[PDB]
């Protein structure tokens, strides 16, 4: 009847959930156009490696063309639409597919992150498109609750939109929880121990990754460092038997016994051979030290940036608590 401030913003978030739907499918279009076929005919990566990173993303693109097909066929004449629920309940099943998605990506993100030290690769974002569809699954619960606050009582889609976002959010609540479990195993079975004592019970009993990642020392070793619950990993990605592992640079550091001191920028010292302004060798470093008798250790890291280097500085304090 009277048209509501409302009902516009209602349209809206019907309007800008099939948008999305569009960028999504345009992006990961985008994405093997651009840097899959490419890579292929020049032979960039192997078709294996190239079938491991945009392979699966494939399967997920339909799923995305079924929804905006069906959010576009509803429109009526003049462009509004009546009610999305029923569509969004229909179509949610398909979303099981993200389960085997967002499983294998530790292996795909693993690889890439391996890639970026290869030149002829980084002689040309590729580094960040495999969290696109992540992101979106994680982004529906919002989504469909922009629509629902502007549906009005006597219109069914309130029931059915609550229902669209509590199955979205048990969807995504489990696949976070797999996604942390796989990370976790995925890192600890290529560890590679090469000296002895490196072993520790603790990097056994771990099943959560507080966080990991790539730091270069202040002797511009570059390491990949793994902080599980409790116990600190360093070490240096290297190809042992055709596998990219991760070869222990020193023992384990438990949390417990872990001592963290921030560095203030310049006040790191550097050796070796030697980012390529001085300013930018000396800048985001922490040093995280060890007491262990005659097997003592001490190393300062340097972050990507100041923002990685508190992330890094967060989560050790959060995991010694």
């Given at each position: 009847?009277?048209?509501?401030?409302?009902?516009?913003?209602?349209?809206?978030?019907?309007?800008?959930?099939?948008?999305?739907?569009?960028?999504?499918?345009?992006?990961?279009?985008?994405?093997?156009?651009?840097?899959?076929?490419?890579?292929?005919?020049?032979?960039?990566?192997?078709?294996?490696?190239?079938?491991?990173?945009?392979?699966?993303?494939?399967?997920?693109?339909?799923?995305?063309?079924?929804?905006?097909?069906?959010?576009?066929?509803?429109?009526?004449?003049?462009?509004?639409?009546?009610?999305?629920?029923?569509?969004?309940?229909?179509?949610?099943?398909?979303?099981?597919?993200?389960?085997?998605?967002?499983?294998?990506?530790?292996?795909?993100?693993?690889?890439?992150?391996?890639?970026?030290?290869?030149?002829?690769?980084?002689?040309?974002?590729?580094?960040?498109?495999?969290?696109?569809?992540?992101?979106?699954?994680?982004?529906?619960?919002?989504?469909?609750?922009?629509?629902?606050?502007?549906?009005?009582?006597?219109?069914?889609?309130?029931?059915?939109?609550?229902?669209?976002?509590?199955?979205?959010?048990?969807?995504?609540?489990?696949?976070?929880?797999?996604?942390?479990?796989?990370?976790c195993r995925?890192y600890k079975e290529?560890l590679?121990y090469?000296?002895?004592?490196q072993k520790d019970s603790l990097i056994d009993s771990s099943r959560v990754?507080?966080?990991?990642?790539?730091?270069?020392?202040?002797?511009?070793?570059?390491?990949?460092?793994?902080?599980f619950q409790e116990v600190?990993v360093?070490?240096?990605?290297?190809?042992?038997?055709?596998?990219?592992?991760?070869?222990?640079?020193?023992?384990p550091?438990p949390?417990?016994?872990?001592?963290?001191?921030?560095?203030?920028?310049?006040?790191?010292?550097?050796?070796?051979?030697?980012?390529?302004?001085?300013?930018?060798?000396?800048?985001?470093?922490?040093?995280?030290?060890?007491?262990?008798?005659?097997?003592?250790?001490?190393?300062?890291?340097?972050?990507?940036?100041?923002?990685?280097?508190?992330?890094?500085?967060?989560?050790?304090?959060?995991?010694?608590?």
């Amino acid at each position: 009847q009277v048209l509501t401030a409302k009902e516009i913003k209602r349209q809206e978030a019907i309007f800008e959930l099939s948008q999305g739907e569009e960028d999504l499918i345009e992006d990961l279009k985008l994405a093997k156009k651009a840097y899959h076929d490419p890579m292929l005919k020049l032979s960039i990566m192997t078709e294996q490696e190239l079938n491991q990173i945009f392979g699966t993303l494939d399967s997920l693109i339909p799923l995305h063309e079924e929804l905006l097909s069906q959010l576009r066929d509803v429109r009526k004449p003049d462009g509004s639409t009546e009610h999305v629920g029923p569509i969004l309940v229909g179509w949610l099943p398909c979303l099981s597919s993200y389960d085997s998605y967002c499983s294998n990506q530790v292996a795909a993100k693993a690889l890439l992150d391996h890639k970026k030290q290869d030149h002829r690769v980084q002689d040309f974002d590729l580094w960040n498109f495999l969290d696109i569809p992540r992101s979106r699954l994680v982004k529906y619960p919002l989504l469909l609750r922009e629509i629902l606050r502007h549906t009005p009582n006597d219109n069914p889609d309130q029931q059915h939109l609550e229902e669209a976002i509590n199955i979205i959010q048990g969807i995504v609540a489990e696949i976070n929880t797999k996604t942390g479990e796989s990370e976790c195993r995925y890192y600890k079975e290529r560890l590679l121990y090469l000296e002895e004592g490196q072993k520790d019970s603790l990097i056994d009993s771990s099943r959560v990754l507080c966080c990991h990642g790539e730091l270069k020392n202040n002797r511009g070793v570059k390491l990949h460092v793994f902080l599980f619950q409790e116990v600190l990993v360093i070490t240096r990605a290297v190809t042992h038997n055709e596998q990219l592992c991760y070869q222990l640079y020193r023992q384990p550091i438990p949390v417990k016994d872990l001592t963290l001191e921030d560095l203030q920028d310049g006040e790191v010292r550097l050796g070796g051979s030697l980012a390529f302004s001085n300013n930018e060798r000396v800048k985001n470093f922490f040093r995280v030290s060890f007491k262990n008798g005659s097997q003592s250790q001490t190393h300062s890291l340097q972050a990507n940036d100041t923002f990685n280097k508190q992330q890094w500085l967060n989560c050790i304090r959060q995991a010694k608590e």
